[PDB]
Amino acid sequence: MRCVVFNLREEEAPYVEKWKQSHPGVVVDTYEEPLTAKNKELLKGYEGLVVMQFLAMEDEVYDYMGACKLKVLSTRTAGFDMYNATLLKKHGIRLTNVPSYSPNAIGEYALAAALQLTRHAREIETFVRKRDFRWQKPILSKELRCSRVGILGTGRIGQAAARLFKGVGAQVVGFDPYPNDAAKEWLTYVSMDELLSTSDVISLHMPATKDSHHLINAKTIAQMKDGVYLVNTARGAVIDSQALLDSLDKGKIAGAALDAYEFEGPYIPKDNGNNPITDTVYARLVAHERIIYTPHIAFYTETAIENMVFNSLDACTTVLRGEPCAAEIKL
Amino acid sequence: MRCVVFNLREEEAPYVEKWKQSHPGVVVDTYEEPLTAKNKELLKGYEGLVVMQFLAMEDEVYDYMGACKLKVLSTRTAGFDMYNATLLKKHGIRLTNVPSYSPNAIGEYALAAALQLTRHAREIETFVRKRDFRWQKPILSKELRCSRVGILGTGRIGQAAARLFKGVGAQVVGFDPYPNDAAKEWLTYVSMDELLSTSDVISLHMPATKDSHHLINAKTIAQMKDGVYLVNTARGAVIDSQALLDSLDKGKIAGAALDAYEFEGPYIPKDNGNNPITDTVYARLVAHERIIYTPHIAFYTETAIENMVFNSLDACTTVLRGEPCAAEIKL
Ligand SMILES: [Cl-]
Ligand SMILES: [Cl-]
């Protein structure tokens, strides 16, 4: 029952210690550094590997996992395509993930960002910095209780967002290819056309599929209300980014909050102070005056960290004991 | 029954027209400009005067109201100390105000500002500006559903805030000298000491009485949790401003959102681009990196404007009909 954790961030460390305290007899050694060809020897003697690493591990790292007879690689994230499933399977190494951390974290961020937009936070700041303290129409707001909010995607996260928008008084409508009864507690299902053409705020909550790809594009943006506000806490591929930029530049969309960009991979979650953004679309997005751009932090709350740590260690050790694990990805 | 409206702003005009459409036969003439000694003759023939004026009227204006036999001055605001009640009473002119516009507007702003603080909006934007897109502890957030929010003052506005905070999952506690049962739908009443010492976010909603003056001061701040967030949508006098600045500088209070400042009167709601803020406390406060300063706009929503217009015209005309008016200020 020997486990090693890499990529350990400072906020994760106390949760690892809490988990260890509640699970005596499990060895859990930790490293802040990533696992690479250069330090692969640190794997020796462990049966479980717990990681949160977007940087690719060289093939020789996986081969060394095989030579060490590693039994399971457990990621702390929902995504797992950043790991080499081919080599895991070849060496008989199992794989687990963490499918959900905190739906409420992401719904709460969607509400927070929506309120930054509808309450004109950035425009007020611009005026305040110039000492223009007037009560003037450009900063006059519409209350969410007088607004319609459209939720695109009604899985657990979309439902959390819908619940929160209804909780502040908004009329919430939803669209999903597979409507469910639970979401009807917080929203009314409508057609795509109705959601697009009548919503004051649109918040995206769809997973990555062939059918969510570029759902928000020049054609669907053209159907929206003039002055709509758009929030994206889903993956970036749901938006055709240039179409969004064009619509912001023309004033069709009054503002957007983007926590994701379709091609953010080279840059998230890294310090790029000395790493120029060479994707000119992304460089425009991140700097746009009408976009509240955030680096994929909708999830980034204490509750999410706790669940990422506890659930990954639980999954890892469940597999090590040869027990069924609902978070196991069969290869 | 003739009424004249001064100080008419762009956003108010459609509501005046809507009110006129449902009160055919009442003359309601409008002016965008203020009423002053230079245009006092515009008062001839009017019985009701409806105002929202930021500039003192000279004594001779009030004397001219008396000569014209004006019956009532009706403000569109809750405050009325900006008008010369001494001369209104001398000339037998009655006074009405608008005690409430949209409690939800102000509660919604308190929630919006709280979420800017708890979700680290400004700190994230500062990292984004530097292209630092790391998931780093300074921008890790605590969800409101895992937080205690303390509501100081449980009138209509505090109740609206409490309802909205509960609506996003927070555990809401309240303190008031006179607890009421309506507020108990949304919060639990606790002692002042308990509210101060256990709240993650404190939102102020108390009227400006001797008892609430500098309620937030060096002593009560010292009772708070390290890293508390503070929101003030109430009047500025409930906070000892220098004590707040000191505690922000020392890191005791992690951040504050202030929609008001005790000595803001010379500057609100004016364009001060050509008017220095000579009050050095206010100048520091508006510029402080840990303060989200806004120019008294928590109320500033479409619904509030509609209610300011409708309620002032209703009060004015109720008085002119010789009927009792709950919004009349007896001088
Ligand atoms: Cl509104
Ligand atoms: Cl949390």
Author numbering:
A (entry chain A), B (entry chain B): 1 to 331
Paper quotes:
Herein we have characterized the structural, biophysical, and biochemical properties of the first enzyme (d-lactate dehydrogenase [d-LDH]; TP0037) predicted in this pathway.
The protein yielded crystals that diffracted well, and molecular-replacement phasing followed by standard refinement approaches resulted in a model for the protein at a resolution at 1.38 Å. The difference electron-density maps associated with this structure were carefully scrutinized for evidence of any bound substrates or cofactors, but the only convincing densities were assigned to solutes in the crystallization medium (ethylene glycol and chloride ion). The TP0037 crystal structure featured two domains with a cleft between them. The interface between the monomers was formed almost entirely by the respective NB domains such that the two C domains were found on opposite ends of the dimer. The NB domain protuberances noted above figured prominently in the intermolecular contacts, reaching across the dimeric interface and interacting with each other. E264, H296, and R235 were the structural homologs of these amino acids in TP0037, and they adopted similar relative positions in the putative active site of the treponemal protein.
